[PDB]
Amino acid sequence: ARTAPAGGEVRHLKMYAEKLADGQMGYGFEKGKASVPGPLIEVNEGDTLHIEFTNTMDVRASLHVHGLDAEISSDGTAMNKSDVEPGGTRTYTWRTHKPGRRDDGTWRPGSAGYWHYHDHVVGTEHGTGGIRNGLYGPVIVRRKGDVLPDATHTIVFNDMTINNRKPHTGPDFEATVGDRVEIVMITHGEYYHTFHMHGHRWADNRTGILTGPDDPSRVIDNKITGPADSFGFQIIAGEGVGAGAWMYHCHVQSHSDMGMVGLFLVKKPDGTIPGYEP
Amino acid sequence: ARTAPAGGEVRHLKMYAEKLADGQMGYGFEKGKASVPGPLIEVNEGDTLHIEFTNTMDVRASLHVHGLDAEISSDGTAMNKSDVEPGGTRTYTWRTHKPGRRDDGTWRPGSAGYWHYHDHVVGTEHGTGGIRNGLYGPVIVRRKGDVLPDATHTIVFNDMTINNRKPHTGPDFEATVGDRVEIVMITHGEYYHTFHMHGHRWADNRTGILTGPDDPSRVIDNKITGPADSFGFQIIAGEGVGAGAWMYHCHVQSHSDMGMVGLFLVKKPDGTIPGY
Amino acid sequence: ARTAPAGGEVRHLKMYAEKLADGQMGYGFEKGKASVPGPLIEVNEGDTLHIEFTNTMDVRASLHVHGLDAEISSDGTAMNKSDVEPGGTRTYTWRTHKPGRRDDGTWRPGSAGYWHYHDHVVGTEHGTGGIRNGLYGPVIVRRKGDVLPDATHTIVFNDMTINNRKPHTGPDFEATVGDRVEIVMITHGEYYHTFHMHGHRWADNRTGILTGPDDPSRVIDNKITGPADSFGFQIIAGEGVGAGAWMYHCHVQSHSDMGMVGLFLVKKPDGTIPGYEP
Ligand SMILES: [Cu+2]
Ligand SMILES: [Cu+2]
Ligand SMILES: [Cu+2]
Ligand SMILES: [Cu+2]
Ligand SMILES: [Cu+2]
Ligand SMILES: [Cu+2]
Ligand SMILES: [Cu+2]
Ligand SMILES: [Cu+2]
Ligand SMILES: [Cu+2]
Ligand SMILES: [Cu+2]
Ligand SMILES: [Cu+2]
Ligand SMILES: [Cu+2]
Ligand SMILES: [O]
Ligand SMILES: [O]
Ligand SMILES: [O]
């Protein structure tokens, strides 16, 4: 549904950090259902979120968030003991706020935007081991009136991989011509990257959408990103270009050649993609 | 000419891909007149552009564009047989659109901006060979009312080179104090860069120009870029700083040291340049 | 106060380039009081600045500035002999200008912004030696109406160091909850970086501050930077998150692991910091 809503609710949520069978580490809302990337958390400006977090691993782990109003006790770092011991359980709290005028007359930003969460404790004091292994996930904070998508996809460039997948695999995403597709794009690790989508483009601002003819933001289909960068956008699938198997990839030449490639499969109403072999 | 116009007309155009005597590969509007970078293509929002493309090389080649409304048949990739056989000829179509309100009440962006075209098939499935050899070129799409420059210069950071030129060989550009100079800045290859100009600055938005006093865009003279990034801007030559041999270079220290340097030569009305 | 008063006044200043005892090279306002980074230079749009520069070193050195209206005679490059001989003295001139309509009806940008000065001559004709040794410093140009901070801190990512300091040695900065803190963020050298601040966020525009509700600039807490990049922002210390030892670091994993970390120490009114022992 378009736009909405007001926002300002208290939200409760359970979350777990698990070591997976393949040696990777992931977050999940349920035990045995962890994923890389971790599950999407979407809230509205003003919402308070209480996360009952449980470390089911044999090493210390934490939950650390970007952009959201988290107190030092919910920082998720080793230094101030806001990380979690093996088998332990801690309640992290993320608050959010609406924009508005301060007493001094200046404008307070508001927490709306495309954010992410990750471990800060596994491997090193900066979560190098955790992030490498897959302990990361997307967070979206919505402002009142923000356009809502048909579906949201998370693309994370972690080191030389997309979503910790083996080279030249996925992820591939499906859509029908006209679908409002939202992309959350996060980067992690050592390397700078350049995200690129074939046949689609977005505004380089907060939402990825231009508000009106007054917005001077650059319209792009290619964007440089570094570790811990997060941005997002919405596109109309196949808008002005029609159905097809539209590539997305890192445009760093050796990166794309070594398998940092996926497909945005845009289908006709009848379900066919020209000219693609399933 | 300053400002405008509307669009869009239907444009027809011929383009060729050639192996050069250097060993490099270039695009051109005519056989024997290929260049690195390839020729500039400038259109207005709304224009439809039909390119009669001919691959004169012994390997498969393609034409792939950023930003413009090109259908999957004009994607220029091997994956869906959109590339071209040796000796072959294919018609690529690029469409452009004005911004406007969608039926749902949201705002559709529009094609206007600084874009680029390149090969997607030579060397690898991603045109690593073609791009390295020089198969790249600039594309400008104008919005109705966009300020038009006196001249347009294309600077491409390809790997450790500028426009595939040997270290410490420019290119250099000339202008007179007061000339409205447009720069199209494209990056290709493996490495990140920082584009920098002495004595000049621009807005970090679509046009490179601030619309008015309400535009909050950062005014910059230094910008980080990665492979396939493209941006552009207009500057008034020598504005507030006067004539001179103004350096432009990548600011990555070893890059500038190893030859990623050129000169923006701004002359007095009499033709002289202070210093130099 | 609160806001910038508008220039332009003619300002005179003395500056020295010294080789320090430890082997580093620094700028200073007084002979013997050189620092890395060099001293902050803050002016208002319209101001003219005359810098009486003296090279006290045994090699050639220069003063080169970003963003400000400097003539070719004040470029500070070997090319046009605007660098300074050992023991020599040269008067550099930096001018600034307000935005306005040109004769042709277009809008001229104006000098306002976060800028930097550095050497262009030591080591190579691009100042690679000087910059590595520490010859760099911040420059701020204010526009009329610009919100003034309580304090300004300079964070320079020079190669694998912050402000040429040894790994894991800060620098740390102190503030009290509610203080308007300004950060000037400059990058130099060979490497790309990602600047990140725990518990704080800013707008990705000229001032780092949103003008009003109409500003579409992305609100971020993480930003990719390359050599010679400069940006700045203002934050309300501990806003929405309270006091604490808030971490700042380059988010490139090996960089933070190898010492590119510091602390933004936000104190309670009573001077205590939760979960932090001194
Ligand atoms: Cu951190
Ligand atoms: Cu990459
Ligand atoms: Cu492409
Ligand atoms: Cu982080
Ligand atoms: Cu591609
Ligand atoms: Cu470079
Ligand atoms: Cu410079
Ligand atoms: Cu491309
Ligand atoms: Cu320079
Ligand atoms: Cu770094
Ligand atoms: Cu963090
Ligand atoms: Cu510089
Ligand atoms: O972090
Ligand atoms: O591409
Ligand atoms: O520079």
From TrEMBL, chains A, C:
The lineage of its organism: Bacteria, Bacillati, Actinomycetota, Actinomycetes, Kitasatosporales. Cu(2+) 1 binds at H64, H196. The chain holds residues 39 to 316 of 343 of the full protein. One of its GO terms (molecular function) is oxidoreductase activity. This is Copper oxidase. Keywords: Metal-binding, Oxidoreductase. Residues 35-144, 158-268 form the Plastocyanin-like domain. Cu(2+) 4 binds at H120, H198, H249. Cu(2+) 3 binds at H66, H118, H251. Cu(2+) 5 binds at H193, C250, H255. Cu(2+) 2 binds at H64, H196, H198.
UniProtKB/TrEMBL annotation, chain B:
Cu(2+) 1 binds at H64, H196. It comes from the Bacteria. GO terms for molecular function: copper ion binding; oxidoreductase activity. Cu(2+) 2 binds at H64, H196, H198. Coiled coil: none annotated. Residues 35-144, 158-268 form the Plastocyanin-like domain. Cu(2+) 3 binds at H66, H118, H251. This is Copper oxidase. It comes from Streptomyces coelicolor (strain ATCC BAA-471 / A3(2) / M145). The chain holds residues 39 to 314 of 343 of the full protein.
